[PDB]
Design a protein around this ligand. Sequence first.
Ligand SMILES: [Mg+2]
Ligand SMILES: [Zn+2]
Ligand SMILES: [Zn+2]
Ligand SMILES: [Zn+2]
Ligand SMILES: [Zn+2]
Ligand SMILES: [Zn+2]
Lengths: 144, 109, 74, 96, 198, 46, 97, 48, 301
Amino acid sequence: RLRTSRTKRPPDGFDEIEPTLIEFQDRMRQIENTMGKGTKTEMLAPIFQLHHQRSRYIYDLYYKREAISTELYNWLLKQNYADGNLIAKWKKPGYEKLCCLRCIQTAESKFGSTCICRVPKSKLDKDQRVRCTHCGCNGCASCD
Amino acid sequence: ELARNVPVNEMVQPALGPANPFVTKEQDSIKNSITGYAEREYVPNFVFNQEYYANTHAIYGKRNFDDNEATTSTDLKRKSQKIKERREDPGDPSILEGDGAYKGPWAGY
Amino acid sequence: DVEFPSICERCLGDNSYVRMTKEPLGQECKICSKPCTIFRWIKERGQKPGKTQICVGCARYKNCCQSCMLDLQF
Amino acid sequence: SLCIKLLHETQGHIVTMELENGSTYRGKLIEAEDNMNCQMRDISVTARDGRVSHLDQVYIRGSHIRFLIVPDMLRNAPMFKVGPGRSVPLPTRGRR
Amino acid sequence: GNLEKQLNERARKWRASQKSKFGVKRKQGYVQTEKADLPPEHLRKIMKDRGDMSSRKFRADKRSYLGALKYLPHAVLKLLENMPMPWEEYREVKVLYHVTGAITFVNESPRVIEPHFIAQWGTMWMMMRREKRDRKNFKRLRFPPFDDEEPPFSIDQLLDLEPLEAIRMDLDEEDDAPVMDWFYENKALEDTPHVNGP
Amino acid sequence: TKLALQKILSKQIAQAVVQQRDDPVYIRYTPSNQMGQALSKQRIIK
Amino acid sequence: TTKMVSLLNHSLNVTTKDGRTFVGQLLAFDGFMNLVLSDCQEYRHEEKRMLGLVILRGEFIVSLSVQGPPPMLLSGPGVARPAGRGIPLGQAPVGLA
Amino acid sequence: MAHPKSHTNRSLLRQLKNTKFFQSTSIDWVEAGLQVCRQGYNMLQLLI
Amino acid sequence: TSDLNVPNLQMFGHTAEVLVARFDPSGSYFASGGMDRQILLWNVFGDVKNYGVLNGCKGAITDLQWSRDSRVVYCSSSDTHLMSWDAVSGQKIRKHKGHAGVVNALDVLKVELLTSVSDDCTMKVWDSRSKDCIKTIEEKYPLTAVAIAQQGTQVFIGGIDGAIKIWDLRNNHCSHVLKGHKDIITSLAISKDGSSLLSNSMDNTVRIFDVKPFASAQRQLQIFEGAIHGQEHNLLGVAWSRNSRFVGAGSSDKNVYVWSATGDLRYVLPGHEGSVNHVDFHPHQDIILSCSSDRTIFLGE
RNA sequence: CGUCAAAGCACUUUGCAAAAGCUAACGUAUCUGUUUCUUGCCUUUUACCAGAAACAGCCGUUUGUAAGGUGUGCUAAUUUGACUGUAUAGUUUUUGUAAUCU
Ligand SMILES: [Mg+2]
Ligand SMILES: [Zn+2]
Ligand SMILES: [Zn+2]
Ligand SMILES: [Zn+2]
Ligand SMILES: [Zn+2]
Ligand SMILES: [Zn+2]
């Protein structure tokens, strides 16, 4: 993950996108330091937020604007700058706007069911449109 | 655990008694637990889930008195259309500090 | 077969269809001081989940509800 | 090939063979080749008509053979799998 | 209208039932998935917020936090088993942690190629002898390295520094061509046909 | 006697391995006229 | 020639260029279709002769046909036990309550 | 030297990973060591 | 009233809902299969224990059919396949492919001919060695159950439309429909002689029809109420007795139903823990087989 | 390399089961504990000393099998297995010394 001055030089298309990744890292640090205003699980929601956003940025670089070479993209996934499993989920129908990967797997729930965010809002009542407790998600379903 | 297979027409099974007046409503019902009867049943997950889903939706509709919708295939998308238009747009990643900053599934209302 | 705890339908929700979990030996009976299993469910969406507080031996010797302790007859 | 392998197996026994003439030969087989050229000893030739003569050493050419009556106890001779390149059916231990 | 729509709805419901019963990836009506990996900042934030456990905000987790004392020596073994070797500046380890932040097992085993391992350690032997001969003043590290009552080091400022340089022989450009690009890696030939896989 | 002793022995021996036995059970439940009212409809539990 | 392998161990009758017929069990064939017949009988016009183990040359053979077929689960977790039927007091489908 | 006895494959770490109370990630070794030291110190303090 | 050691025998096994369990034509053996992707073989008389398991199927056994030889078994899988299992040795004989969905039902012929339907709205007839569908019939809505006549030219296919289709394999003329049902036909079974068809449908009525080239109009013989279907849309089976005078069925209301073929209910016996998928009668004695989605199969009289 | 057959394949996660039969490294590595004996130092116990026998625990390894994950495909890719696998009209078998009558 961490790169030294004497490490192998990343592929060519890296430097122009290096600064924004640096900004992502900076704010992740700030979120780590920032404390208060939530329950034991709510304070850990913004982490997944930024993480999904960062992975989506890389996904947008490759699959929507073809701004990065395939070599650089494999390098980025190998350096954990993006979550390979989350991107794999984004590449199949029904999970285009997946929030995180803990809201899809059923072994982490009380009754073996996915999260509320995975459910389309059309069949969900108006009153029970609440923030996810896993990551604060406000609706994953591809329809919305 | 009736061990003998027996035809139908002798299944009336009458109590054959004066049917005691003295029993009250709290004794009219047979039970295992103090509150009522409970016994095993092999329901597959999906059917129990979807029917419970429908009953919960019906209860919410009865409570809020707001039941003015239909159901179809294209109707699902049509219902989703207005909830989508009420929602603010999701920003574009790499726009990151205000003025169209990216917010995806976390976008509010 | 350790099947059910006795709960009245006033605090079992107005839905005829609810889901609940058990955690064996999860609490000491507040009367028996005995190891007993807990049961958690949801009365209705939007309120804090309920749970049984007394063992099966009690609420039966008292003919009472394990969660609300209102007598099951009056 | 398995047939010439059995013919080679026969050498040293007494084998009866008849040629394109119709004469049958009764003697001890001493040599055999892939062409089925045969060398024989103490042959008792029975002609097509029935005349019986005797021979001592012959070298019958293979191309003039109809069939042979191999001794019976060679029925249990092993028929080995033959690979592509191998020219003699032998037990194998490599790939094939 | 009528027949076509009614039959369409019936086929819809029947196909939904069939998909639930015999789905492509469904076990008991639900889709199957694998337990994934959370970002390391999750664990970092957990350990930062917990601190010394001197807050009532986490007062419900203390019993579990203390019960992991039973398995702590296992964590010690897994940590010491995967200590970085002299030739690597840093080593990234797959880890498994309690959501409480109670315990943290390094979930890996240090599997190496035996000839490669012996070659690397012989190289270390050469370089260490050379440096002990050439240093002429060797200042041994003091013990204990940190002051007794010093607070434990903050991970926030340990990730900003350049990791310095390790013990690495100057492998010849031509004589040691075969092993140049992978002699000092952690998983040496992981992505090449020389090893079966990850 | 063998069955009873085996059962009691397994119960006693079972008292460090992480327990992994999770599978739903469904039960058909019938309420019964607690405080008058109008009884209640049949329920089943997950 | 894969079909020819299927005739191994079958009983065969072979008509020869001479006009005779050999009947017997096939042991092994050849690329030139030299045949090895075990327990062979001779059909000389019909006269019967026991021959035994016979190797026919490829040239001698004209046609061949078969006359007879060639001479010729662990456990499970299931356990049964008697039991009776327990009548329920309800009349409703499993899903509906 | 004893010939190893037959036994089914079992491992504590996999059993723990199966539960919902344990997660997984990849971190620097020194960070994991600091975490283990801090956790052990906190545990020892809580029993004292 | 039979040779069974016990009047009622509970069979324990399988790891999920059992979907089918069919008697050997000889009446001496039978097999069972379900959602556990496994086939269990049993012994009708004696200790009633397993003598083999048929592993290798990569899907739930939606249906299976014994062979008249009582030596090979044909299994239909939910994974769009049709395997042929050698009962006496347990090896893969052949795997017939060609469908495009879950294969719902299977039937065998008096001649080595197999038939099947699947959710791809198709019916396929298979030779036991062709490994390919020699004939294919395309419909508009998915088909649910099949019945092949032992004579070998008419096939009855029931699907979503609620009307039984009769297909002549040689004729390919289909302008003859057994109308009368109003919902999904779960199962079909032909009488032993080949004159009467037993139909069960999700419209809650178990009906009986006649299978003859000629009719006096209203081919419907009679209907039976009571057998109700739940909301899980299961495929509930029906059976023909060895004498073809008692018709049997299973219902999702935890009831096994036997009728006298004259409209008079005969058996109402409960005893199941879940929806009862399949019911069958012994071809020699008065045994009735039950198969429910609760990992258990019941013996009978 | 060729033909035939069936299996999507490569990598990977988890569960279950098994691992000497013909004297031989499941692990070319290497710890701890209990019981029963014999010792060493010993004011008594734990903690110990070092040999044996009988037992267990832990760190690991291999194989079969089942259900999944990632990446590529089914408009082909790879793997596994089996194979009595090859030319050739010019003398030793397959491009006729045959017909003719007896
Ligand atoms: Mg004392
Ligand atoms: Zn979400
Ligand atoms: Zn989420
Ligand atoms: Zn969620
Ligand atoms: Zn109550
Ligand atoms: Zn109590």
